Design a protein around this ligand. Structure first.
Ligand SMILES: *C(O)(O)[C@H](C)[C@@H](O)C=O
Length: 268
């Protein structure tokens, strides 16, 4: 619905400066504050655009239109509206988890706009299929969805340490803070939307060069998924391995992740 309104509603911030513009797009259970530790490594060299997904706890939940956001294309529309409102013609995009999915879709809709993709904790499909290992079974996610409805607080308390992976208490506390900030119904709806999404068929339509960041264990992304993305993404793709584990390296290992981001965003 907007330039100015949307910029306010989604907490859009532009920091740093440079000819190289970089958009940082957070994942489920967090907001843009997840990038706070890596941000100082980018703002000397880059103009950084940060924003909150509509489902973030830091956005007023009465903006969340359940009908509209029952597919990821609606989230892509927001991203493209923001970039158009800021008059940005070209950028690199760093997306975590659901935002990696959003980045892939957005790079296909507007190949002129996305010069490079950096995908963290990324998967094209979480559910297993005939000759495809996503990491999840239908009955498993059914139980997760039930837990989310029956006792959101208990679910979130259990999930936070598993998502962080490594024993980094401060990161668990931080992810828990934002996860508890999400409205329980919106959280469930986002999860349901993600688990219905299957990007496999469109990966070859991506034209941008892509860096897939792989940690040594991610509860939501089997190791074989990074290799799948490398084999099927349509642009020049590399897989960069972090020497630690987790689904949220920007929270748990920000200095290590920053090394990869600086190298990936050097030229595009
Ligand atoms: C991500 O966390 O956004 C991802 C889609 C997966 O974690 C589940 O939603």
């Amino acid at each position: 619905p907007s330039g100015a309104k949307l910029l306010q509603i989604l907490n859009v911030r532009v920091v740093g400066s440079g000819e190289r513009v970089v958009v940082l797009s957070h994942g489920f259970g967090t907001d843009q504050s997840a990038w706070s530790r890596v941000l100082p490594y980018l703002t000397r060299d880059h103009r950084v655009v940060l924003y909150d997904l509509v489902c973030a706890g830091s956005v007023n939940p009465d903006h969340f239109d359940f009908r509209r956001y029952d597919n990821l294309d609606a989230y892509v529309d927001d991203l493209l509206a923001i970039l158009d409102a800021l008059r940005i013609p070209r950028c690199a995009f760093v997306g975590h988890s659901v935002s990696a999915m959003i980045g892939i879709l957005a790079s296909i809709r507007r190949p002129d706009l996305f010069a490079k993709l950096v995908l963290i904790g990324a998967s094209p499909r979480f559910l297993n299929d005939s000759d495809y290992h996503g990491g999840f079974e239908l009955e498993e996610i059914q139980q997760v969805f039930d837990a989310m409805g029956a006792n959101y607080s208990a679910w979130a308390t259990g999930y936070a340490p598993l998502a962080v992976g490594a024993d980094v208490p401060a990161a668990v506390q931080e992810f828990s803070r934002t996860l508890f900030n999400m409205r329980p119904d919106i959280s469930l709806h986002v999860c349901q939307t993600v688990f219905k999404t299957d990007l496999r068929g469109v990966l070859g339509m991506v034209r941008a060069p892509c860096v897939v960041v792989q940690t040594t264990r991610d509860v939501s992304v089997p190791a074989s998924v990074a290799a799948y993305l490398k084999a099927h993404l349509g642009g020049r793709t590399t897989v960069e391995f972090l020497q630690t584990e987790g689904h949220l390296p920007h929270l748990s290992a920000p200095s290590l992740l920053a090394q990869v981001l600086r190298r990936a965003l050097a030229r595009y």
